[PDB]
Amino acid sequence: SGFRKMAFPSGKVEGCMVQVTCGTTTLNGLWLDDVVYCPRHVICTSEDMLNPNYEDLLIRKSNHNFLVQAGNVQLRVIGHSMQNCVLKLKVDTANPKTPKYKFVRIQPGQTFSVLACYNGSPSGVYQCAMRPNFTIKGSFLNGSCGSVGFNIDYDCVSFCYMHHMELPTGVHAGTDLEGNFYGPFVDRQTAQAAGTDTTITVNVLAWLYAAVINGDRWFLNRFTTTLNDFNLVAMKYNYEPLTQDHVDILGPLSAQTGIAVLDMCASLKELLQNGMNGRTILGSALLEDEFTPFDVVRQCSGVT
Amino acid sequence: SGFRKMAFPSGKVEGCMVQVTCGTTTLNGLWLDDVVYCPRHVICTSEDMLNPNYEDLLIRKSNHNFLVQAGNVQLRVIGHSMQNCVLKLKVDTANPKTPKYKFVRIQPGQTFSVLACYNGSPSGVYQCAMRPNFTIKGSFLNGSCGSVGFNIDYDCVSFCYMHHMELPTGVHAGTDLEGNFYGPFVDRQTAQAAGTDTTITVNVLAWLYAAVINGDRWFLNRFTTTLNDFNLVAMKYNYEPLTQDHVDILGPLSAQTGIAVLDMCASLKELLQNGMNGRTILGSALLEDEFTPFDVVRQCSGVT
Numbered sequence: 144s145g146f147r148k149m150a151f152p153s154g155k156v157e158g159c160m161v162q163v164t165c166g167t168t169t170l171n172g173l174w175l176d177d178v179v180y181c182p183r184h185v186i187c188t189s190e191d192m193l194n195p196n197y198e199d200l201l202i203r204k205s206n207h208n209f210l211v212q213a214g215n216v217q218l219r220v221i222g223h224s225m226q227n228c229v230l231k232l233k234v235d236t237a238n239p240k241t242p243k244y245k246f247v248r249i250q251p252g253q254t255f256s257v258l259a260c261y262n263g264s265p266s267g268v269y270q271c272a273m274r275p276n277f278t279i280k281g282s283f284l285n286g287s288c289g290s291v292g293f294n295i296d297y298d299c300v301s302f303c304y305m306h307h308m309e310l311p312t313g314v315h316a317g318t319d320l321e322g323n324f325y326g327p328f329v330d331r332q333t334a335q336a337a338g339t340d341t342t343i344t345v346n347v348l349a350w351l352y353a354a355v356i357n358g359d360r361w362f363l364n365r366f367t368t369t370l371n372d373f374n375l376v377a378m379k380y381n382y383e384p385l386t387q388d389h390v391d392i393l394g395p396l397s398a399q400t401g402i403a404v405l406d407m408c409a410s411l412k413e414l415l416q417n418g419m420n421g422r423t424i425l426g427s428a429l430l431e432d433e434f435t436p437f438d439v440v441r442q443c444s445g446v447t
Numbered sequence: 448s449g450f451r452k453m454a455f456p457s458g459k460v461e462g463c464m465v466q467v468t469c470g471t472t473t474l475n476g477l478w479l480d481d482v483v484y485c486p487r488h489v490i491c492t493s494e495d496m497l498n499p500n501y502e503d504l505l506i507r508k509s510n511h512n513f514l515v516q517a518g519n520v521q522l523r524v525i526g527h528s529m530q531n532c533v534l535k536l537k538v539d540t541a542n543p544k545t546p547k548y549k550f551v552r553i554q555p556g557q558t559f560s561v562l563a564c565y566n567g568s569p570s571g572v573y574q575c576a577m578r579p580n581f582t583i584k585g586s587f588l589n590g591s592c593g594s595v596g597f598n599i600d601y602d603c604v605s606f607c608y609m610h611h612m613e614l615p616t617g618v619h620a621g622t623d624l625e626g627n628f629y630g631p632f633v634d635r636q637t638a639q640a641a642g643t644d645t646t647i648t649v650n651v652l653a654w655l656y657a658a659v660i661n662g663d664r665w666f667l668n669r670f671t672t673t674l675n676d677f678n679l680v681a682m683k684y685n686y687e688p689l690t691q692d693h694v695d696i697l698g699p700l701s702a703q704t705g706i707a708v709l710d711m712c713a714s715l716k717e718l719l720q721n722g723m724n725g726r727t728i729l730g731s732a733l734l735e736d737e738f739t740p741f742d743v744v745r746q747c748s749g750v751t
């Protein structure tokens with residue numbers, strides 16, 4: 144029993160983290176086969192970051208300007224390109240610890256593990272959700288850039304996030320491993336707005352199922368509701384509208400609890416309308432939306 | 448910026464996890480040098496667990512009754528003993544992936560990372576606190592027994608916890624790596640009470656410092672207080688009494704925020720007396736006590 148925010152075990156990603164240095168900027172790189180991936184703003188001075196022309200800045204740089212270090216071992220750069228907002232540094236040495244891997248662009252509301260790194264050394268691992276507004280609420284200090292988000296499928300690491308920048312709330316924006324930002328952000332230090340951020344309704348339901356499975360049932364009331372009716376309560380409380388895809392995704396949890404999704408929506412409506420009256424659900428005094436149905440099924444039926 | 452419950456990177460511990468099988472019971476073992484450590488109740492049938500005589504039960508067992516598997520590799524057992532509530536299985540093969548390690552007994556209020564494992568395969572990693580009543584609030588399904596808690600100091604893994612049992616709230620009890628339970632618990636399926644559990648006051652203060660460092664300051668009020676005066680508010684709210692050791696431990700955070708500990712206590716008193724009035728601190732609608740000052744300094748000044 145018990146329900147915690149759990150990250151994937153990070154070992155397979157630890158073996159891929161390197162330090163990348165150009166001028167005095169140091170950040171983290173991801174070393175897979177004979178290619179090191181990092182944020183392209185590694186080539187910028189503090190001044191450059193205000194309005195950088197990355198093509199012109201990159202042109203001043205040659206292979207030998209890029210100090211790539213794996214532990215206490217210097218890799219030799221034999222090629223450099225920019226793909227969108229990532230630098231790819233081609234090295235002579237394939238990473239002998241390269242796991243089976245893929246690059247995936249994750250969808251809003253999906254979760255991933257972050258291996259927060261400094262100077263190419265892993266400090267810590269935690270679980271994050273891609274918010275509907277394509278930010279994450281991470282823990283990222285100066286040095287953390289190029290730290291990566293991932294999922295593990297069997298023995299296969301799916302890399303989905305590289306850390307680039309912090310936005311004015313203490314929220315985080317970054318790219319996929321092809322260097323495409325999640326959201327409207329650009330890698331320039333100028334005014335930029337994250338959208339209004341909605342609650343991942345299907346995640347909150349999954350978490351209420353998690354609460355039921357773990358014996359927290361108090362919020363389970365006498366009522367039911369309709370897709371139309373709940374989705375009207377959702378709109379008012381800045382929750383994302385629930386679809387039949389969502390109802391279908393909740394099937395395994397529904398079937399494990401013998402609680403119809405629409406009953407669970409009725410409980411949710413009453414929590415949104417009445418609040419929680421000083422009580423807790425899985426030790427939280429708030430509705431939690433950073434667990435996918437997948438994460439709940441994984442944790443509550445224990446897959447490796 | 449940002450503040451999250453972060454676990455140590457788990458790679459060094461992943462390489463130590465094995466599967467241990469006796470009769471039809473399977474759980475996790477920790478393989479260090481030529482010794483595999485697991486919970487001794489691996490030798491029990493469901494019936495045995497009610498009132499086991501571990502000495503007599505162990506006597507029915509020989510080296511060959513113990514199926515130790517590292518991935519798809521069977522280790523050969525050349526010795527077995529019981530130390531307190533752990534079995535030590537001596538194997539022919541030293542773990543080639545043995546990290547630099549120590550066994551430590553942690554104190555109440557200290558944190559550690561759990562690598563939750565099933566059939567000797569790591570599923571996930573999360574951060575836990577040894578509660579004042581020597582339980583933990585983990586995520587542990589059938590199969591999780593022998594999963595371990597640890598800290599990483601430099602390159603040195605300090606193992607501090609092995610998972611043994613679940614108590615009636617969905618709370619967890621286990622041993623150090625010498626097989627001594629934390630708390631009054633025994634490895635028998637019979638009525639057992641965890642003490643009343645107090646709040647780790649020094650941890651809550653560390654977390655309020657974390658909140659200030661990250662710009663959440665609203666709870667910072669005009670008042671101050673005394674050690675005696677706050678500790679009287681603490682007693683009433685089931686908080687552990689704050690000592691000068693605690694004030695001294697909060698020094699680095701005090702000095703980083705230029706906020707006197709006793710002012711921060713005054714804010715805490717008002718939160719305990721008035722509650723939070725529907726507001727949040729670092730995205731929590733509750734006072735968080737599972738971060739040590741150490742964890743706050745680590746995260747908020749980024750050590751690897």
Ligand SMILES: *[C@](O)(C(N)=O)[C@H](CC1CCC1)NC(=O)[C@@H]1[C@@H]2[C@H](CN1C(=O)[C@@H](NC(=O)NC(C)(C)C)C(C)(C)C)C2(C)C
Binds near residue numbers: 170284288332448
């Ligand atoms: C990483 O590059 C790193 N070296 O680790 C770094 C992390 C942050 C945490 C403080 C430094 N990211 C940046 O430096 C990033 C690079 C410049 C400016 N960056 C920012 O993150 C800035 N954010 C920002 O200007 N946000 C908007 C665009 C105004 C909303 C900081 C003000 C936090 C430095 C670029 C290219 C975006």
Ligand SMILES: *[C@](O)(C(N)=O)[C@H](CC1CCC1)NC(=O)[C@@H]1[C@@H]2[C@H](CN1C(=O)[C@@H](NC(=O)NC(C)(C)C)C(C)(C)C)C2(C)C
Binds near residue numbers: 474611615634637640
């Ligand atoms: C591990 O052994 C394992 N195989 O992974 C297991 C984990 C729990 C989660 C369901 C099984 N632990 C036990 O089986 C443990 C072994 C027996 C009974 N155990 C319990 O955890 C029981 N708790 C319990 O009886 N608690 C008290 C003592 C009544 C407060 C369960 C009821 C949860 C099975 C022993 C030796 C304690």
